[PDB]
């Protein structure tokens, strides 16, 4: 278990994420996704 994923380092990162939200619509919602009809086909 990496340091970032436990104890105080995690708590701190989580708090920071709540109070400083990132633009998830741009950062993740604009990036291409596989077609739902492709999910069970070749990758």
């Amino acid at each position: 278990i990496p340091a970032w994923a436990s104890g105080n380092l995690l708590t701190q990162a989580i708090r920071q994420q709540y109070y400083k939200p990132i633009d998830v619509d741009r950062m993740y919602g604009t990036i291409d996704s596989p077609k739902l009809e492709e999910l069970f086909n070749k990758s």
């Binding site: 994923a5 994420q17 939200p21 619509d25 996704s33």
Partner: protein
């Protein structure tokens, strides 16, 4: 995305869901990992397609966000909002029952999220504590859309959900609509405050009987306000159930809720 775009932290739940960190943004999320071969063997491909299609298009502070998804040779990965306070059902079990402030806050959040869904003709159909997670400040997050349906025009027929939460119209084999979620919200409010669902019985037939008779028996410790809200949701006739806007405006909800909207970008 690929799996190498993420630092895997630890398993969160076995079903597998992992606490993960997206490398370039140092952004902590949950990664749900599903096996393609198992999904095909079990025959649940279209079921999964539908769940992803519904959840990935919902954006509300009290609905667990699906940021994106990707796949490789053997697996499908769902990039999900991390709910740091975890499972609501575990918190309920730990405490036995919630106080009025906690319950009213959850009810306001639930009604808001369900209103958002219903405005898009999405019916949830399985509201219960086990399908809810909790955010950084304890905010309700609808986590799971396993029984959900986009129902724009046709009334529905499928019996679905969870025994203690089933509305009369499902049990009786009638068609149903979005008002099923209103019934389940009433059952949920009762379970929050009491610690047991209202129609709890030794047998499925006796449970069904209690539901269709709305055999509601309030414990003495409940406030008049809480009983008023529950009674107005648990109506036999779907059109008579208190609307979601009505839940949010209910005096007991107004007097007791301590709801906080999360900070938004930016």
């Amino acid at each position: 995305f690929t799996i190498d775009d993420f630092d895997i932290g630890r398993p969160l739940g076995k079903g597998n869901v992992y606490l993960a960190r997206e490398k370039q943004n140092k952004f902590i999320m949950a990664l749900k990992v599903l096996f393609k071969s198992q999904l095909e063997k079990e025959g649940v491909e279209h079921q999964l397609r539908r769940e992803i299609e519904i959840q990935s298009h919902l954006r509300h502070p009290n609905i667990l966000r699906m940021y994106n998804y990707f796949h490789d040779r053997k697996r499908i990965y769902l990039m999900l909002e991390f709910a740091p306070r975890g499972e609501l059902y575990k918190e309920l079990q730990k405490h036995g029952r919630f106080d009025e402030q906690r319950s009213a806050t959850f009810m306001e959040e639930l009604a808001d999220a369900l209103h958002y869904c219903h405005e898009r003709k999405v019916i949830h159909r399985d509201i219960k504590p086990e399908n809810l997670l909790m955010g950084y400040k304890g905010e309700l997050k609808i986590a799971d859309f396993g029984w959900s349906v986009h129902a724009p025009s046709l009334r529905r027929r499928t019996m679905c959900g969870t025994l203690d939460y089933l509305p009369p119209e499902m049990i009786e084999g009638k068609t149903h609509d979005e008002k099923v979620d209103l019934w389940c919200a009433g059952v949920l409010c009762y379970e929050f405050l009491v610690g047991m669902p209202p129609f709890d019985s030794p047998s499925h037939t006796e449970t069904h009987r209690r539901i269709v008779n709305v055999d509601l028996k309030f414990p003495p410790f409940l406030s008049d306000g809480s009983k008023d809200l529950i009674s107005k949701l648990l109506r036999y006739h779907p059109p008579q159930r208190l609307p979601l806007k009505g839940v949010m405006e209910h005096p007991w909800v107004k007097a007791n809720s301590r709801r906080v909207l999360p900070p938004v970008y930016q």
